Amino acid sequence: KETAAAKFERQHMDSSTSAASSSNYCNQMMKSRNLTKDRCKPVNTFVHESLADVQAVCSQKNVACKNGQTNCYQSYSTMSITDCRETGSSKYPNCAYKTTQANKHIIVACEGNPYVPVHFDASV
């Protein structure tokens, strides 16, 4: 088992780099983090901020989640993220991704005790 919170850090945290390093980035990371094991995860965002910073978002701006639930929060500041988007030539198990760096507000769903991020909802 892996807790919800550990899963979030696995799928979305990458504080070692401040930006989307290369055009290779998503191809390497999606595989490293086991995001291309059962299929190619269509889209995935990595956050290049400190873990304390991303956790703090749970006390920031409360907004509606895409799914209609209300445990979503938006960062007051923009954060450095990298979006990974599956390409056309991407054919499981040979998943292919486009790497895109950006600075945006992230929206995460939080839960538990302590209240931590468990899902990445959107970036804006």
7 marked as binding residue: yes
Quick check: helix, strand or coil at residue 52? Answer: helix
Name, in order, each residue with C-beta under 8 angstroms of 71's C-beta and a sequence gap of 6 or more: 65, 109, 110, 111
Active site residues: 12, 119
Is 61 annotated to bind a ligand? Reply is no
Is 43 within any annotated ligand binding site?
yes
- The answer to whether 85 is annotated as binding is yes
On whether 66 is known to bind a ligand per the annotation, the reply is yes
Reported residue count of the chain is: 124
User: Is 1 known to sit in a ligand binding site?
Assistant: no
Q: What is the 3-state secondary structure (H, E, C) of 19-50?
A: CCCCCCHHHHHHHHCCCCCCCCCCEEEEECCC
Per the annotation, where are the binding residues for substrate?
A: 7, 10, 41-45, 66, 85
Q: What are the binding residues?
A: 7, 10, 41-45, 66, 85
